[PDB]
Design a protein around this ligand. Structure first.
Ligand SMILES: [Zn+2]
Ligand SMILES: [Zn+2]
Lengths: 289, 49, 101, 781, 64, 196, 49, 57, 57, 114, 69
RNA sequence: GUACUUC
C-alpha cells in the first residue's frame, strides 16, 4: 500500500452489507450466481481417439450427473450449450491455429433430431474445422463432437491444447470477480465478502445489498469510482485493520497524515521515486534515489 | 557503456558510479557525516540514578 | 511338482538374440557364430542384401549368471538342461566413410 | 558414576604413550581431511593425480616447414607433448638434501611446501621418437599428518620432540606462517539423475516449461561437469554443456545416437515400453524422432552424427588441426556428456542417459515428486583436499597450453630450427613460466580460485578459512564444517535455512550460528565418518547379478513396474519389484555378516517403495567419495552397521531400546546422544534447556578463551588467547573424556547465588565477587 | 513393425517417414532404399486420456 | 518448580486420554469418523494424498492443533495453581510470572505442566516424500505425540524426537528474527524522505 | 545518547551526566533501557556530545 | 564458567580532535586510526523527530 | 556465560564485605537474577547445580 | 572375420523340435555362476512363484514371469542357425532362480530389558 | 595449569595439598571422598579446588628450548 | 577487493 503504487492486488476483497429481509438461505443463490466457474469444473473424463485415414479428431467429454453439476453451480443446459458454441469452439480455433503457425517456425447416441441439425449447421456457419457436434439434451452426461483436418497438421498434441481452453473458457464472468464467500457474521453485522472489486455491476443488486455500506480493499477503484477522499477514508480502515489484527495501538492522527499525503496530488502517490517525480525541491529526488 | 571485458574483478568507476558508492553515495557524506566528539562503548545497569 | 533332469552338456550350439520386437526374419542368409577360449564369451556376425549383423554377448556382466534351455512334451513333463548364450544384436547398415577436409 | 581420573590423565602428561596414540577418535575427526589428500597418492594407479594426468590426452602442434599437391598438402612434422606422471615426494630444503619440519617452518614464516616433479612424454610424428625430461614446478604446500609431511608415522611421544602438540590434530595448510584450512562445501549427488522443479528454466528459454532433470557425473579423477536436461513445451528436450563461459543447447539425438551403434527403435524401447496403452509417450517420442528426421534427413548413422558433432565443436575445444571430426566428435563426447562411465563406457552410457530421459517423462506426467535442492537426500560434502587435487588437474594444463602457444609463437617470427634438438626443447621450455607453487599459494592465501577451465560449482570465492587458535572446540568444529554456499546468501527465500528432519544423525540440528549464517553452515554430528576412498568393487555386479538381477541388455523395460538398481554411475538393470523387497534386507544380511568377501560393510543401500507419488522406484547403492556415514546398531545378529544419507528417508529406525516394536523395526541407534555435535553433546542436560538458548550458546561454546594447545613457545599466530585456571567440569558427559578434552581446559567452577540481592544485576547481567578476582578468577593472557 | 502411430522398418532397423508427408503408396528408408509400404497398413488408431489432475474443482473434492 | 504428588496424577491422567485424540483428529478429516486403527487400506488412501500439497495439510493441522491445544489448556487450568506444591504468593517463580514482572502464564505452562505443540508458521512438522514424518517410527504416521506435539516437560526431561521438533521450531524463530529487522528499516527510510 | 538501530523518537534522547572514577564500562538505568529496547548482554551504545 | 573473547578494552571509542580525511575532510573510518561514530539514515531523521532543528545542522 | 546459553556481563565487582554469607561461612562468587529464568527457560542451570553441588560434596 | 580371437564353431548337436499343432514348448530359466550345472539331478517346478530348492548352500527361490526374444534352432550343421517359427515365435514363461537367503527372524527378547 | 593457591571462594591455602593428595591415591588406594576429608578440606568450596585441578603445567614444560630434546 | 565476527 505504501510503496508499490497500488495496482492489481494479490487478493481483491469487497465487503457487502445485506438487508434484514434477506436470509442466509437466500445468500447461497447469490454466491452461486456471482461465483465464476471455469469450464474445467464441469468435466469428469476426457478420452480422444485420434484416428487418421486426412486427420480426424473425435472428442468425448464425459460430464457429471445432471443434478450434480447443475444444482451445485446453478448452471443448466441453456448456459452450457451457448457458452461452448460462442466461447469454447472459437477459442479452439484461435489455439489450434496458433500452434499451427509456430509448427513451421456404453453406446453414445445416434439419430440426431432436426432441432440439433439446424443447431449443428449453425456452428458450421461460423466455424470451419468441426464437422459434427452432438450433445446429450435429456441427461447431459457427455459432449461428443467430430473434427476433420488435412495432412498439413499431421502431428500435434491433443490433451494439452484443450485443457488450456478448459481453463480459459467462461460460463459467466462477472467483471473482476472470481468467487463470492459468506463469512460468519461478527458483532451482529452480517456481511458478504467477495473475491474481487467491481462497483458498476454490483450497484444493480440493491434488492439484497446496501450500496451505502459496501467497502473495498483496492484503492484505485474506489478512487476512480467514488472519489479522492472516498479513497482516503477507506485506506484508513485498511491500515487500521492491518494494525488491529496484532492488537497493537496507534493513533488515527498519523494514519490520516499518511492517508492524505498518499492522495495529496489529485489521485495517488507512491512514496517512491516515481511518486517523488512530482515535487518542487530538487534535493528531495537527488538524496532519495 | 564500456567494455564487455574479461572478468575484471570489477570495472573502474569514473564519475557517476563513483558518485554512488552503494548506489547512493549521498548517503555516505551528504545524508550522514562522520561525527566528531562522540563516544562508543558497552553499557552497564546502574541503580541509585 | 518335482521333476528330474536327463541331459547336461558343456559345449554351445543354440543361442537366443535380443535385437528388438517383431522382426520380419526372411531367414534365407547364412550367419556366423564366433567363439572364444575366463569363459562364456561369444560373438556373432552376419550379412544380407541391406543388413549387417554385428552382435556381442555381455562383454561386462555374463560370468555371474547363465542361461539354460529345455523342452517338454505332453508325456515327458521334464526339462533337459542345455547351455545357451544370450546374444545382444545391433543391426547396422552401410552409409559410413564421409568426412570434411 | 562417570568417574573422572587424576592419576591416569596425569600419567599421560608425565610421559606420552610409546605405543599408538590414545583417544583415537580425535584423530578420526580429521580422517576426512587426512584421507582426502592421502587418496591422491595412496592406492592403485599411483593415486588420483597419476590417473587424472592419464586422462588428460595427447596434444600436438605443427610447423610450417614443407615435406620435401599432396606434398604441399602436408604442412609438416608435428610436435607431440603430453604429461604422464607427476609426483610429490617430500618437503626438503638444504644448502644430499636435509629434512625440514613444519613446526620449525612456522617460526621460519615460510609456507610448509613439498617439491613437485613432472616427466614429459614428448614425441614427434605420432611417436617416432620420445624425449624424456623431468623438471620441477615449485613448492606445493602440504597439510599436517599426511602422506607427505613427516608427521605421518611419527610416534605420539616423539611428536613432543618436534615442537608440536602431543595430540596434534593436523589436516590444515601452512601459508605465510599462518594456518588456513580449506573450507568444506556441499554439492549435488554424483551419478544420480535428479528431478527438480525450478522456474529459472523459463527465463532464458522461449517456450520452455518449468520442469527439469539434471545429473552430475564424476570422472575417476573426481572432477565433474553437470549434465542438464530440460523439458520444452513444444514437445522436445534440451541438453546443455558447461564450458569456460559457453553453453550450447545440444538436442538429445546429437548427444545420444553419437555414442554407439544405436540407430533403431531401441531409443524408444529404453523409454517405457512394458505396455503401449497410454499415448502420452507415443506423441512425446514421435515428436522427438520426427524432429530428428525433419531438419536433416541425410543424417542417419553413428559416423555422420560424430562428423557433425566434430564440425560444430571444432573450435570450441581447440582440437586442431590434425584431429579430424572423427576424433573431435568423440573428444567432446568422452570429455563432456556423462563422463563418469569413462572410455569404452558407451555400452551402458546410452542406457543410463536414455533412462534419464525416461524419468523426464515420469516427471512431466505427474507421478514422481521433485527432489529438493537443499534436502540431504542427494547432497554430498566435498572434502576440500579433493578440491585441491581438482585444481591441480586443471592447473597442470596451463603451462601445457603455454608451451603450445609458445612453439606456435616462434613459427610466426620464423627462426625455428628443427625441434629434434634437446637444446631447442630446453630453449623453448625455459622461456615460458612453469612455476605452479606460487599459484597454488595464490589460491590458498587469497581464497578465490582463478579457474581458466571453470569448475562445476557456482561460487568462485570463499573456499578457505583462517585458524586463529581461540579454543579447541572451534577447531574440532572447523574440521567438521559444512558450508552451504555464499551463492545462497544472495538468494532470498529461507527454504534452505529451515531444517529438514533428514538431518537426523548426520548434521547437528542445534549446532548452528545465529544471525545471517543461521541455517547455512551447520557442522557434523558426533560419530559420523566420511568415506574418502572408494572400495574396490570388482565383484558387486558379480554378486548382485547372481542374486536374481536381470542383465542390463536383457531387460529392455522401464517404468515404476520394475525396481531399477543403480550402483554408482553404472546400472546393472531392473527386475520384478518384489525381488527388490527381499534383496532390500538380504543384501543387508550379507552386508552385516563377515563371511562375504565381495561386500564391504560401508555399502549404503537405500530402498524405495513404488507407491504414492514416491521418488522413482528401485534400489540405490553408493560408496564412492565425498559421502556421509554414521553407524547404526543392527538387531539381526546384533553388530555395528553403517548407513548414509539415502537410508534414513524410507526405512525406519528407533532411538532407544524401548521404542523397539515387532516386525516394522529393523535398525536402532545404540547411543541416542550421537545426534548432537561435539559442542552440542558437550553441554550437560541438553534436553532441559530451550532450543533458542542452545543455539544462542553454540557460538559461545566455540568462542571461548580456552587453552588452544601446548605449542606457545613455537607458534607464530598473529593473535592468541589463553587462560590458566581452567578447570574440568564435574558434571560432564563421557564424550568429554573420550576426546581428551582434559588436555584443553575451557572453563572453571564458581559458587552460584540465585538472588536479586545485589540489585545491579538486571535480568541479563552477572556479578563477580571482588575477592575471587583478587585471587585470579578466570585469569587470562 | 507397426505399433501405435509409428511404423518401424526392420530390414535395416529404423523408422520410416510419414506415409502422408511424401507421395503416398510408396515410402523410402533414409539409409537404404526398401520397397515400402505394403499398401495395407491400417487406419491409424490411438487414444489419449487426460491425467484428471488439471481440473481443480469443488465437486471432485466431494467425490473423496 | 515441584508440584504435589496429588498434582502429577492429574498430568498423567489427562495425558492418557490424549493418545487416541491424535488418531481421532485425522479420523475426522479423512471422512472416516469411527472405530479403526492404521490398518484399513481405505483410510490409507486418504492422508497419503493429504500430504501431497499445502492446503490439504492446512485443513488437518487446524483441527488437530486446536483440539490438542484444548487438551493442554485443561491441564494448565486445573493443575496450576491447585496441584503445585508451593503456590502463590510464596512460590517465587509462579508469583513473579503472573504478577507481570517477567514472562507470562504461557511461559510457566511449559516449565510447570506442558510445553506445547511444536507448530511452524501456520503449520507443523513436515513429512518426507517417503510419507513418513520422522524415521523414528513406522511409516504412515497417525499420532499427535510423534506428530510434533510434545508430552514431556522441562522439569523431568523430554523425548529426543520432541526435542528435535522443539529444535526445528527453535530455529524458525531465529530465522524470522534475522529477516524481521532487515525488512523493517526500508519502511522507515522510504516513508521519512517523503514525509519530512 | 543514541543507540542503533534507532527506530523512533525515544531511541535518541539527551541525558544528564554523572561521572564515576572506578570502572571502564558505560552506565544506564533500569527504566531507561526499556525505551532503547536494549539489554546488557554486551550491547554497546553510542555516546554523543 | 567459560570466559569469553568479548570486549574488555576492545571497543574503547572516544575522540575529541582526530585526524580527518583528505577527499572529504571528515573523520576517518575505523577507531585504530582514531575514528568517530557515524550517524546513519535512521539517526539523521530521528534527530529532527524531536523538532530540535539546530541539532541537525 | 556457561554452556547452557545464559550470557551476561559483570555490572559491579561486589566485595566480600557486602556479599551474602551462607551458614557454612563461604560467600558465593556470583549472583544470578532469578527473574531471567521465566523467559530464558534455562532450567538446566538449576538441575545441573544440584548435580554440581552433590559432586562438590 | 571379426574379431581376431579363437575360432568359429565346428560342432553341433541335434534338436528334437516337432512343432505340434497337448503342447511341446521350450523352457528358459536363469541361474547364477556358482551353481550345480552338472551335479544337479532334480529341480521341482510349480505354479506362480512360491517354492524353494534344497542343495548345499540351500538358498533358492524360483521366480516366474509372464510379460521380443527369439531363439534360433540349429536343426543341422551347415548354416548352424535357423529360425524358430510355426506360422517369429515368442516365449510365454521366462523364469529366474534367485538366491534368497533365509532371513533370520523373531528374536526380540534379549534387546528388551526394563 | 598450576595449583591455585588461595581458594577463590573461601581463601584457604590449596597449593600445599596437591602432592599429598596424589600420594593418597598412589600408596594408600583411598577413593576421592575420604581423601578430601582426611586431607583437611571440609567446605565444598575448598573441595572443588583440589578435586578439580587439572595440573596442566607439567604438559607445558615438555618443550625446553634451553636443552637438547 | 575476498573471507570472518558482535545485539
Ligand atoms: Zn529401411
Ligand atoms: Zn574454598
Amino acid at each position: 500500500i505504501v510503496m508499490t503504487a497500488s495496482a492489481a492486488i494479490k487478493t481483491p476483497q469487497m465487503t457487502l452489507p445485506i438487508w434484514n429481509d434477506v436470509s442466509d438461505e437466500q445468500a447461497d443463490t447469490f454466491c452461486k450466481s456471482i461465483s465464476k466457474v471455469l469450464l474445467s469444473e464441469v468435466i469428469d473424463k476426457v478420452i480422444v481417439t485420434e484416428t487418421t485415414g486426412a486427420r480426424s479428431y473425435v472428442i468425448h467429454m464425459r460430464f457429471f450427473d445432471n443434478n450434480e453439476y447443475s444444482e451445485e453451480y446453478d448452471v443448466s443446459k441453456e448456459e452450457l450449450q451457448n457458452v461452448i458454441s460462442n466461447q469454447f469452439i472459437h477459442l479452439l480455433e484461435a489455439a489450434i491455429v496458433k500452434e499451427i503457425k509456430k509448427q513451421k517456425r456404453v453406446e453414445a447416441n445416434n439419430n440426431m433430431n432436426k432441432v440439433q441439425r439446424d443447431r449443428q449447421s449453425a456452428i458450421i456457419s461460423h466455424h470451419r474445422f468441426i464437422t459434427k457436434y452432438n450433445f446429450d439434451d435429456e441427461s447431459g452426461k457427455w459432449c461428443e463432437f467430430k473434427l476433420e483436418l488435412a495432412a498439413d497438421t499431421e502431428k500435434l498434441l491433443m490433451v494439452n491444447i484443450v485443457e488450456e481452453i478448459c481453463r480459459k473458457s467462461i460460463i459467466r464472468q462477472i467483471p473482476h470477480i472470481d468467487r463470492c464467500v459468506h463469512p460468519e457474521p461478527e458483532n451482529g453485522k452480517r456481511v458478504l465478502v467477495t473475491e474481487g472489486v467491481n462497483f458498476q455491476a454490483m450497484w444493480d443488486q440493491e434488492a439484497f445489498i446496501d450500496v451505502d455500506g459496501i467497502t473495498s480493499n483496492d484503492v484505485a477503484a474506489v478512487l476512480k469510482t467514488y472519489g479522492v477522499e472516498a479513497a482516503r477514508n477507506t485506506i484508513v480502515n485498511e491500515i487500521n485493520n492491518v494494525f488491529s489484527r496484532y492488537a497493537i495501538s496507534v493513533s488515527f492522527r498519523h494514519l490520516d497524515l499518511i492517508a492524505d499525503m498518499m492522495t495529496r496530488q489529485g489521485t495517488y502517490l507512491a512514496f517512491n521515486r516515481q511518486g517523488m517525480e512530482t515535487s518542487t525541491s530538487s534535493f528531495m529526488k537527488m538524496s532519495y534515489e | 557503456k564500456a567494455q564487455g571485458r574479461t572478468s575484471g574483478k570489477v570495472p573502474i568507476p569514473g564519475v557517476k558510479q563513483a558518485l554512488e558508492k552503494k548506489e547512493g553515495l549521498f548517503r555516505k557524506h551528504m545524508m550522514g557525516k562522520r561525527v566528531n566528539y562522540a563516544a562508543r562503548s558497552v553499557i552497564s545497569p546502574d541503580p541509585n540514578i | 511338482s518335482e521333476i528330474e533332469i536327463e541331459s547336461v552338456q558343456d559345449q554351445p550350439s543354440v543361442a537366443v538374440g535380443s535385437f528388438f520386437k517383431g522382426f520380419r526374419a526372411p531367414s534365407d542368409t547364412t550367419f556366423d557364430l564366433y567363439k572364444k577360449k575366463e569363459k562364456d564369451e561369444f560373438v556373432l556376425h552376419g550379412e544380407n542384401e541391406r543388413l549387417e549383423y554385428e552382435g556381442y554377448t555381455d562383454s561386462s556382466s555374463q560370468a555371474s549368471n547363465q542361461y539354460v534351455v529345455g523342452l517338454f512334451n505332453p508325456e515327458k513333463k521334464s526339462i533337459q538342461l542345455y547351455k545357451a548364450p544370450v546374444l545382444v544384436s545391433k543391426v547396422v547398415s552401410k552409409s559410413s566413410k564421409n568426412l570434411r577436409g | 558414576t562417570a568417574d573422572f581420573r587424576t592419576l591416569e590423565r596425569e600419567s599421560r602428561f608425565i610421559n606420552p604413550p610409546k605405543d599408538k596414540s590414545a583417544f583415537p577418535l580425535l584423530q578420526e575427526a580429521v580422517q576426512p581431511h587426512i584421507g582426502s589428500f592421502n587418496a591422491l597418492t595412496e592406492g592403485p594407479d599411483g593415486g588420483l593425480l597419476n590417473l587424472g594426468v592419464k586422462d588428460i590426452g595427447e596434444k600436438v602442434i605443427f610447423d610450417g616447414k614443407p615435406l620435401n599437391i599432396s606434398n604441399s598438402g602436408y604442412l609438416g612434422n608435428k610436435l607431440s607433448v603430453s604429461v604422464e606422471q607427476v609426483s610429490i615426494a617430500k618437503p626438503m630444503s638444504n644448502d644430499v638434501e636435509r629434512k625440514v619440519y613444519p613446526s620449525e617452518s612456522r617460526q621460519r614464516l615460510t609456507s610448509y611446501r613439498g617439491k613437485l616433479l613432472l616427466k614429459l612424454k614428448w614425441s614427434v610424428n605420432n611417436g617416432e621418437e620420445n624425449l624424456f625430461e623431468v623438471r620441477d614446478c615449485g613448492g606445493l604446500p602440504v597439510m599436517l599428518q599426511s602422506n607427505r609431511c613427516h608427521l605421518n608415522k611419527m610416534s605420539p611421544y616423539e611428536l613432543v620432540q618436534h615442537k608440536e602438540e602431543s595430540d596434534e590434530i593436523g589436516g590444515y595448510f601452512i601459508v605465510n606462517g599462518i594456518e588456513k584450512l580449506i573450507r568444506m562445501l556441499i554439492v549435488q549427488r554424483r551419478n544420480h539423475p535428479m528431478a527438480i522443479i525450478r522456474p529459472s528454466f523459463a527465463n532464458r528459454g522461449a517456450s520452455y516449461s518449468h520442469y527439469g532433470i539434471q545429473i552430475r557425473s564424476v570422472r575417476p579423477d573426481q572432477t565433474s561437469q553437470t549434465n542438464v536436461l530440460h523439458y520444452l513445451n513444444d514437445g522436445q528436450v534440451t541438453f546443455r554443456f558447461s564450458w569456460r563461459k559457453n553453453e550450447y543447447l545440444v538436442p538429445v539425438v546429437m548427444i545420444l545416437k553419437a555414442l554407439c551403434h544405436t540407430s533403431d527403435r531401441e531409443i524408444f524401447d529404453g523409454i517405457i515400453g512394458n505396455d503401449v496403452k497410454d499415448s502420452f509417450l507415443t506423441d512425446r517420442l514421435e515428436l522427438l524422432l520426427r524432429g530428428f528426421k525433419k531438419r536433416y534427413p541425410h543424417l542417419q548413422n553413428r559416423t555422420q552424427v560424430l562428423q557433425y558433432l566434430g564440425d560444430k565443436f571444432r573450435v570450441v575445444f581447440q582440437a586442431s588441426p590434425d584431429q579430424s571430426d572423427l576424433e573431435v566428435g568423440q573428444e567432446v563426447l568422452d570429455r563432456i556428456v556423462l563422463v563418469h562411465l569413462g572410455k569404452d563406457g558407451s555400452q551402458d552410457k546410452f542406457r543410463m542417459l536414455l533412462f534419464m530421459i525416461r524419468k523426464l517423462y515420469s516427471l512431466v506426467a505427474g507421478e514422481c515428486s521433485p527432489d529438493n535442492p537443499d534436502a540431504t537426500q542427494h547432497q554430498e560434502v566435498l572434502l576440500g583436499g579433493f578440491l585441491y587435487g581438482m585444481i591441480l588437474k586443471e592447473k597442470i594444463d596451463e603451462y601445457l597450453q603455454n608451451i603450445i602457444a609458445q612453439v606456435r609463437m616462434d613459427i610466426n617470427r620464423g627462426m625455428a630450427i628443427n625441434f629434434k634438438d634437446k637444446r631447442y626443447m630446453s630453449r623453448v621450455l625455459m622461456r615460458v613460466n612453469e612455476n605452479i607453487g606460487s599459484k597454488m599459494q595464490y589460491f590458498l592465501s587469497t581464497g578465490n580460485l582463478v579457474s581458466q577451465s571453470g569448475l562445476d560449482l557456482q561460487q568462485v570465492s570463499g573456499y578457505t578459512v583462517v585458524a586463529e587458535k581461540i579454543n579447541f572446540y572451534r577447531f574440532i568444529s572447523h574440521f567438521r564444517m559444512v558450508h552451504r554456499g555464499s551463492f545462497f546468501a544472495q538468494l532470498k527465500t529461507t527454504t534452505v535455512r529451515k531444517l529438514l528432519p533428514e538431518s537426523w544423525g548426520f548434521l547437528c540440528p542445534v549446532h548452528t550460528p545465529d544471525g545471517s549464517p543461521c541455517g547455512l553452515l551447520n557442522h557434523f554430528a558426533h560419530k559420523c565418518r566420511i568415506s574418502t576412498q572408494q572400495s574396490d568393487v570388482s565383484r558387486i555386479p558379480s554378486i548382485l547379478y547372481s542374486l536374481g538381477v536381470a542383465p542390463a541388455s536383457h531387460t529392455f523395460a522401464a517404468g515404476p513396474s520394475l525396481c531399477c538398481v543403480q550402483i554408482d554411475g553404472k546400472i546393472i538393470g531392473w527386475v520384478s519389484h518384489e525381488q527388490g523387497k527381499i534383496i532390500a534386507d538380504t543384501l543387508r544380511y550379507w552386508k552385516v555378516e563377515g563371511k562375504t568377501p565381495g561386500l564391504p560393510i560401508d555399502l549404503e543401500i537405500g530402498y524405495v517403495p513404488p507407491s504414492t507419488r514416491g521418488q522413482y522406484p528401485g534400489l540405490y547403492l553408493f560408496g564412492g567419495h565425498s559421502r556421509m556415514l554414521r553407524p547404526v546398531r543392527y538387531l539381526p545378529l546384533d553388530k555395528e552397521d553403517i548407513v548414509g544419507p539415502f537410508e534414513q528417508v524410507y526405512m525406519n529406525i528407533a532411538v532407544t531400546p524401548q521404542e523397539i516394536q515387532n516386525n516394522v523395526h529393523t535398525h536402532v541407534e545404540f547411543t541416542p546422544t550421537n545426534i548432537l555435535s561435539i559442542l552440542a553433546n558437550l553441554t550437560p542436560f541438553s534436553d532441559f534447556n530451550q532450543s533458542p538458548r542452545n543455539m544462542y550458546q553454540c557460538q559461545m561454546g566455540k568462542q571461548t578463551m580456552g587453552t588452544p594447545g601446548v605449542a606457545l613457545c613455537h607458534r607464530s599466530d598473529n593473535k592468541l588467547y589463553r587462560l590458566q585456571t581452567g578447570q574440568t567440569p564435574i558434571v560432564k558427559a563421557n564424550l568429554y573424556d573420550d576426546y581428551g578434552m582434559d588436555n584443553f581446559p575451557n572453563g572453571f567452577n564458581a559458587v552460584v547465588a540465585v538472588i536479586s540481592y545485589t540489585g545491579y544485576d538486571m535480568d541479563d547481567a552477572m556479578i563477580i565477587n571482588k575477592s575471587a578476582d583478587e585471587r585470579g578468577f578466570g585469569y587470562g593472557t | 513393425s507397426v505399433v501405435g502411430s509409428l511404423i518401424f522398418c526392420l530390414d535395416c532397423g529404423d523408422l520410416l517417414e510419414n506415409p502422408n508427408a511424401v507421395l503416398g503408396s510408396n515410402v523410402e528408408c533414409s539409409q537404404c532404399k526398401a520397397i515400402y509400404p505394403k499398401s495395407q497398413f491400417s487406419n491409424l488408431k490411438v487414444v489419449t486420456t487426460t491425467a484428471d489432475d488439471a481440473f481443480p474443482s469443488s465437486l471432485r473434492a466431494k467425490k473423496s | 518448580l515441584r508440584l504435589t504428588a496429588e498434582g502429577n496424577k492429574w498430568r498423567t491422567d489427562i495425558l492418557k486420554t490424549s493418545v487416541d485424540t491424535g488418531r481421532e483428529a485425522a479420523a475426522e478429516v479423512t471422512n472416516l469418523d469411527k472405530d479403526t486403527p492404521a490398518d484399513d487400506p481405505e483410510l490409507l488412501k486418504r492422508l497419503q494424498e493429504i500430504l501431497r500439497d499445502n492446503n490439504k495439510s492446512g485443513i488437518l493441522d487446524a483441527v488437530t492443533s486446536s483440539k490438542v491445544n484444548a487438551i493442554t489448556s485443561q491441564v494448565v487450568s486445573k493443575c496450576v495453581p491447585d496441584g503445585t506444591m508451593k503456590k502463590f504468593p510464596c512460590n517465587s517463580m509462579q508469583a513473579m510470572a503472573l504478577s507481570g514482572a517477567k514472562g507470562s502464564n504461557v511461559n510457566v505452562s511449559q516449565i510447570m505442566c506442558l510445553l506445547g505443540q511444536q507448530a511452524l508458521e501456520g503449520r507443523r512438522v513436515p513429512v518426507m516424500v517417503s510419507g513418513k514424518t520422522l524415521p523414528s517410527f513406522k511409516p504412515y504416521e497417525t499420532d499427535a505425540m510423534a506428530g510434533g506435539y510434545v508430552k514431556g516437560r522441562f522439569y523431568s526431561g523430554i523425548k529426543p524426537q520432541e526435542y528435535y521438533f522443539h529444535c526445528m521450531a527453535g530455529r524458525e524463530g531465529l530465522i524470522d528474527t534475522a529477516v524481521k529487522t532487515s525488512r523493517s528499516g526500508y519502511l522507515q527510510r522510504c516513508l521519512t524522505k517523503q514525509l519530512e | 545518547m543514541n543507540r542503533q538501530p534507532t527506530l523512533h523518537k525515544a531511541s535518541m534522547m539527551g541525558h544528564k551526566v554523572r561521572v564515576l572514577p572506578n570502572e571502564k564500562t558505560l552506565r544506564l538505568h533500569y527504566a531507561n533501557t526499556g525505551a532503547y529496547n536494549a539489554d546488557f548482554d554486551g550491547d554497546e551504545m553510542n555516546m554523543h556530545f | 564458567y567459560q570466559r569469553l573473547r568479548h570486549m574488555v578494552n576492545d571497543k574503547f571509542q572516544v575522540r575529541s580532535t582526530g585526524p580527518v580525511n583528505s577527499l572529504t575532510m571528515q573523520p576517518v573510518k575505523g577507531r585504530k586510526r582514531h575514528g568517530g561514530i557515524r550517524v546513519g539514515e535512521m539517526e539523521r531523521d530521528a534527530l529532527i523527530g524531536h523538532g530540535t532543528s539546530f541539532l541537525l545542522q | 556465560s556457561s554452556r547452557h546459553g545464559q550470557k551476561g556481563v559483570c555490572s559491579r565487582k561486589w566485595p566480600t564485605i557486602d556479599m551474602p554469607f551462607s551458614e557454612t561461612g563461604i560467600q558465593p562468587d556470583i549472583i544470578i537474577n532469578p527473574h531471567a529464568f521465566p523467559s530464558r527457560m534455562t532450567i538446566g542451570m538449576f538441575v545441573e547445580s544440584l548435580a554440581g553441588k552433590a559432586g562438590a560434596l | 572375420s571379426i574379431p581376431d580371437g579363437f575360432k568359429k564353431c565346428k560342432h553341433l548337436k541335434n534338436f528334437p523340435l516337432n512343432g505340434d499343432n497337448k503342447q511341446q514348448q521350450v523352457w528358459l530359466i536363469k541361474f547364477p555362476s556358482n551353481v550345480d550345472i552338472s551335479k544337479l539331478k532334480s529341480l521341482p517346478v510349480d505354479f506362480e512363484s512360491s517354492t524353494t530348492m534344497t542343495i548345499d548352500k540351500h538358498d533358492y527361490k524360483i521366480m516366474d514371469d509372464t510379460d521380443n526374444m527369439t531363439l534360433l534352432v540349429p536343426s543341422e550343421s551347415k548354416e548352424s542357425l535357423k529360425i524358430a517359427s510355426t506360422a517369429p515365435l515368442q516365449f510365454d514363461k521366462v523364469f529366474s532362480v534367485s538366491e534368497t537367503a533365509k532371513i533370520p527372524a523373531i528374536d526380540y527378547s534379549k534387546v528388551r530389558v526394563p | 595449569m598450576i595449583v591455585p593457591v588461595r581458594c577463590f571462594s573461601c581463601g584457604k591455602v590449596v597449593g600445599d595439598k596437591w602432592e599429598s593428595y596424589l600420594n593418597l591415591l598412589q600408596e594408600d588406594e583411598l577413593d576421592e571422598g575420604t581423601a578430601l576429608s582426611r586431607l583437611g578440606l571440609k567446605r565444598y568450596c575448598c573441595r572443588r579446588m583440589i578435586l578439580t585441578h587439572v595440573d596442566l603445567i607439567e604438559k607445558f614444560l615438555r618443550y625446553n628450548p634451553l636443552e637438547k630434546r
